[PDB]
Each structure stands twice: as C-alpha cells, then as structure tokens.
Design a protein around this ligand. Structure first.
Ligand code: HEM
Ligand code: HEM
Ligand code: HEM
Ligand code: HEM
Lengths: 141, 146, 146, 141
C-alpha cells in the first residue's frame, strides 16, 4: 500500500509467496469458511468441503488478482475496476467480510512462512489487504 | 463461542505448548505495531514512537505476558467467561475507556501469533476453535459496557 | 444499556408518539439507501436497483413497520432483551446469516429517523437514552451468534 | 465525496447549514460526549458540561474544517494534511470515534433540518463524513 516502505515490504512478501499464491489463497478461503460460517452464504453454488475443486479454482483466481494488485499499487482503482463492480454492484458483499478474508490470508501466510512474517511485514500486508478491500467496496454509493 | 468436544480438546492441546512470555509479548507488540492508535493506552510505558521502539519496550512485552495469561484463564473457564472477566471489563470500560472493538483486534493478532508458532498444526479446524475462544473473551470483556 | 429512571421515562414518552408504519418504512428504506450491501438480504422483495426503487418498494416499507414494532417490544421489555429477541437472533444468525454489524447500522439509522421526526425534542439526553436502547437490541439480536 | 452527484448534494446541504455550522458542530460534539462517554477521554482538558466555552470554540474550529473540506472535495488529503498529522500521529484517535462523531453530525442535521435531510442527502453526507474520517486517519501506518 501507499507508502514506499509498505510497497517494498508487500512486494518482498508476495515474491516469497510466489508459486504458492493459489494454494495459500485457497487455504485462506477454507479458513474463512470454517471459522466464519456466515461467509459461506456467498458460495451456495460451491462445494465448500476440504479439497473442493471449486474452492481451489477460485483461490487461483483470487490469488491472480492479488498478484495483479501487488504489480499495480499506484493504480489499484483502474486495475481492479471490474472486480469492484462485481463485488459491490452484483454480489453486494458486506464490507465486514473483506476483513475476515484478509485476516485469514494473514493467518495463512503467518502459518506457512513464520520467519518471514515479522511485525513489519504483518503491518504492511494488513495495509495492502485493507487498500485492496477499500477498492473492491468503492462503489458503495 | 460454544465449543464442540473436539474443539475444547484442540484448544487445550495447543495451549499446553504456549510460551506465555514469548507469545504474549509478541501479541501485544504486534497490536501496537499494526494498529498504532492502540499505543495511546500505553504511553506511560515509555518510548512507543516507532515500531522498533514498541518491539523493544520492556513494559509492553511484560504486559503482553499478563494479557495472554488472562486469555489462558478464559480458555480454561469456557462456560463462565462473563464471570472470569467481570472485574477486567469494568477496568477496561470504566477506568481505561478502551473501545471494545480493540478487543477484537487483539484477538485477531493473537490468532495470527498462534499460527506463526504452530505452523501446520494450526489447522483450519484448530483456528476455527480459537476464533470462537477469542470472540468469547472479547464479548466477555465488553460486557460491563453492554 | 442500563437506563436511569429519567432515561426509561424519556424512552416511553417519545415512543408513544411514534407512527410505526411511517417511521419503520423510513428506517429500513434509509438502511438500504445508505448501506447498499444490505439490499442483498431483501432481493426477494423485488426491485432494489436504485435508491428510488428502494424508497418505493412496498415490501421494504411494510417490513420496516414489522422491524420497528419489534424494536418497540424491546423498548417495553428493557430488563429481558435476550429473551425478547432469542428466536429472532436465531433467525438472523442461523437462517438469514446477517452479519451482526448490520444491526448497529440499523440502530444508527433509527436514531437518525427519530431525530428527524422529533426535532428539538430529541435532545442530546434523549438521544443518549435511545443509543443505549438500540445498542441493547443489537446485542440481544446478536446473542445466538455469541 | 467522490461522485459528482454526492458532491452536489454535500455542497447543497452544507450551504443550507451555512452560518449554523459552528452551533450544529458544537451540538454534535455534545451529543457524542453524552451518548458515547468513551469519547470524553480525548478532552480531559475541557469542561464538557452543556454551554461549555471550550466545546463551543472547538465546534467552531471543527465546523471550519468541514467547510474547508466541502470546498476541496478533489484534494482533501492536501487540504486536511495538518489535521491528519494531528489526529493520527499526535492524538492517536481510535478510528471508531470518527464514526461516532459522524453519526452525531447526522443526528444533529436531521434534527434541525428534517425536510432537507432526505435519504439521498443522508447517503451523500455519510459518504462525505466517511471520506473526511478516512483522510484524518490516513497516517495509520
Ligand atoms: C481481497 C479480497 C478479494 C479479492 C481480491 C477477490 C477476488 C475475486 C475474483 C478475482 C473473483 C472472480 C473469479 C472469477 O473470475 O472466476 C471473485 C469472485 C467472487 N468473489 Fe471475491 N474477492 C475478494 C473478496 C471477497 C469476499 C470477502 C467475498 C465474500 C465473502 C467474495 C465473494 C466472491 C464471490 C461469491 C465471487 C463469485 C465466485 C464464482 O461464482 O466463481 N470475494 N473474487
Ligand atoms: C481483549 C483481551 C484483553 C485481555 C484479556 C486483557 C487483559 C488485561 C489484564 C489482565 C490487565 C491487567 C489488569 C490488572 O493487573 O489490574 C489489563 C490491563 C490493561 N489493558 Fe487490557 N486486556 C485486553 C485487551 C486490551 C486492549 C485491546 C487494550 C488497549 C488497546 C487494553 C489496555 C489495557 C491497559 C492500558 C491496561 C493497564 C496497563 C498498565 O498500566 O499496567 N487491553 N488488561
Ligand atoms: C437490529 C434490529 C432488527 C430487528 C429488531 C429485526 C427484526 C426482524 C423481524 C421482526 C423480522 C420478521 C420475523 C418473522 O416474521 O419471522 C425480521 C426478518 C428479517 N430481517 Fe430483521 N431485524 C433487525 C435487523 C436486520 C438487519 C440489519 C437485516 C439485514 C440487513 C435484517 C434482515 C432480515 C430479513 C432478510 C428478514 C426476513 C424478511 C422476509 O423475507 O420477510 N434484519 N427482522
Ligand atoms: C470529522 C472529523 C473531525 C474533524 C473535521 C476534526 C477537526 C479538528 C480540528 C479542526 C481541530 C483543531 C482545533 C484547533 O485548531 O483548535 C481538532 C482538534 C482535536 N480533535 Fe478533532 N476532528 C474530527 C474528529 C475527531 C474525533 C472523532 C476526536 C476524538 C473523539 C477528535 C479529537 C480532537 C482533539 C482531542 C483535538 C484537540 C482539541 C484541543 O485541544 O483544543 N477529533 N479536530
């Protein structure tokens, strides 16, 4: 997110996630569905059990969007425009739920890369996920 | 925040492995690093001017161990959280005036610290049991504001 | 959400002047206009595509009267809100999956609607008594999630 | 706030507040202190009783800043820069409290100008006060 230091930290952290992005984001979605069952009601059309092809496919897509965001930190509104329309206009996702998914992404990363997940990395990634969530809810007009 | 028998058990097995000094210091320091307005409540603990100052603040680290010990008291009294946290709720509401949303933030950081230390053992199922525990503790701590 | 005797009395005098049809329709319509994601829960009520559609939706207006009647049941049972709202909490949590933060938003809109209709009579003191009431109702409605 | 329609609505509403700004903002502060007593701990140095000269003076200053914001909707970060430093860096105001003050400003306006306070005006003013609050907490880094 916005600051130069936070941008450096997020790009570093995301580079170390690297090819694990799709697996870590599927895991974060599972953690969200398990811990915060209200969030499952957005995915009645999915099998949400463990090992779900639908959850793994969707984790890949969400991870790709996060990777695009990490590459476009100065123009997230444009880079994420279609997704802002989808989440705010079409799906009407409650803003609280972005906090839940962000928290589960932090949990997932902390679990898998604990030495890398310092307090400074946690603060910078939290600010990134808040900035992405703000853009995705921007059409709340 | 009602736990299955399997969830009560998962909660205890992991808790028996928690180093309350190390993880408590880490949870409170991460709260002040990640959510800086929470430093307001601790300014009497000395230098909090930067993240590095927070991370080296001996009093923040010592206080964090007290906080995690207190969470442990909740975790071990899950059927009377309101009672366990009655006097602390009055302290946090009536004397400290901490907005109760911050209790949720500290629970979020504590779950992240557990994940950092337990790795693959902190499974989605184990996490979901802890989310019920921290939510319960926050609710109980908020009670004497309700 | 414990009320002084003076606050219990202020709550009743104003409530006896509330037109539940007009104010209930206005409170639910303002919730969907101001916080649009809340329209998700009501899509079965027909056109909510624009603010004008929300404001003219007969079902949203009718439902709002039911909601304000239910708040009135809380306002008249202030010592057993958990009981009064037990079954509704289960409906909102278990069947509707409304995030409990939204109950706070609806309370905020209801306080604003009361202020709109009562003007200078809705004093800072009268407001503070209603803030305790709406917070109590939200807490009670959230209970079967806790 | 950002959208053209919301900007028009906010400027209209604020023009009708006009010379009542200082009185309405002092009233909103009193409503906040009375309804949400946790907020009083930011003003131990003030007399917070009704009729307080300190609360009336501060309401004038806060209203002036709101009037400046209504005139600078395309550059709020710059217009409010010093105030962002003050609230986030120096005073460390909890972000929840901006929501409380914003709510009390809406209550105050709805009470005093009820015919003017339509659902569309309420949505636009809510978005303005959220944008001002976001700028005032922007340094949460
Ligand atoms: C960091 C935050 C998020 C990101 C980056 C994100 C990204 C995405 C992407 C890229 C898609 C399109 C997938 C595709 O093209 O097939 C999508 C769809 C979707 N998102 Fe999100 N999302 C986020 C948060 C959320 C949250 C919090 C919810 C609800 C709890 C949610 C619910 C959905 C749903 C229901 C779909 C449609 C999925 C389908 O039918 O396949 N999103 N999201
Ligand atoms: C939600 C879980 C929390 C628990 C279990 C908890 C527990 C405790 C305990 C056990 C004490 C010491 C009480 C005593 O010795 O009398 C304490 C004190 C305190 N708490 Fe908390 N606390 C929580 C959250 C918070 C939060 C979120 C904040 C502020 C952001 C906060 C601010 C304080 C302060 C300022 C003190 C007094 C410190 C001193 O001067 O020594 N607490 N808390
Ligand atoms: C916090 C105060 C609230 C109160 C007192 C309240 C009360 C009620 C009542 C009395 C009913 C009808 C129950 C029945 O006839 O079985 C109901 C239903 C419902 N509530 Fe709420 N409610 C509250 C908040 C909310 C919020 C914030 C939302 C969503 C944003 C929501 C969504 C619904 C939905 C979707 C229904 C079913 C509507 C239908 O299909 O007819 N409620 N509520
Ligand atoms: C719309 C949101 C807000 C605006 C526009 C705003 C504006 C201002 C302004 C203009 C000043 C400087 C006054 C001067 O120069 O004397 C100030 C100071 C201050 N603000 Fe805010 N403020 C906002 C929200 C808040 C909130 C939510 C709090 C805490 C609950 C707060 C606490 C303070 C305090 C403690 C001061 C110092 C007052 C003094 O010592 O005289 N502000 N604010």
């Amino acid at each position: 997110v916005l600051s130069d230091n936070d941008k450096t930290n997020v790009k570093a952290t995301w580079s170390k996630v690297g090819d694990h992005a799709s697996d870590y984001v599927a895991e974060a979605l599972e953690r969200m569905f398990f811990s915060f069952p209200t969030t499952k009601t957005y995915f009645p059309h999915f099998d949400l059990s463990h090992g779900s092809g639908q959850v793994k496919g969707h984790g890949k897509k969400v991870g790709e969007a996060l990777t695009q965001a990490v590459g476009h930190l100065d123009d997230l509104p444009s880079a994420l425009s279609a997704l802002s329309d989808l989440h705010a206009h079409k799906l009407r996702v409650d803003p609280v739920n972005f906090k839940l998914l962000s928290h589960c992404l932090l949990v997932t990363l902390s679990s898998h890369q604990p030495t890398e997940f310092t307090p400074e990395v946690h603060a910078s990634l939290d600010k990134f996920l808040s900035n992405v969530s703000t853009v995705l809810t921007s059409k709340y007009r | 925040v009602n736990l299955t028998a399997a969830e009560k058990t998962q909660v205890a097995n992991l808790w028996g492995k928690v180093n309350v000094k190390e993880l408590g210091g880490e949870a409170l320091s991460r709260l002040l690093v990640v959510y800086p307005w929470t430093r307001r409540f601790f300014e009497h603990f000395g230098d909090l001017s930067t993240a590095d100052a927070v991370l080296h603040n001996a009093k923040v680290l010592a206080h964090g161990e007290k906080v995690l010990t207190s969470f442990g008291e909740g975790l071990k009294h899950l059927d009377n959280l309101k009672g366990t946290f009655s006097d602390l709720s009055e302290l946090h509401c009536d004397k400290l005036h901490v907005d109760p949303q911050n209790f949720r933030l500290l629970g979020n950081v504590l779950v992240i610290v557990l994940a950092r230390h337990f790795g693959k053992e902190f499974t989605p199922d184990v996490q979901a049991a802890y989310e019920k525990v921290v939510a319960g503790v926050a609710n109980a701590l908020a009670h004497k504001y309700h």
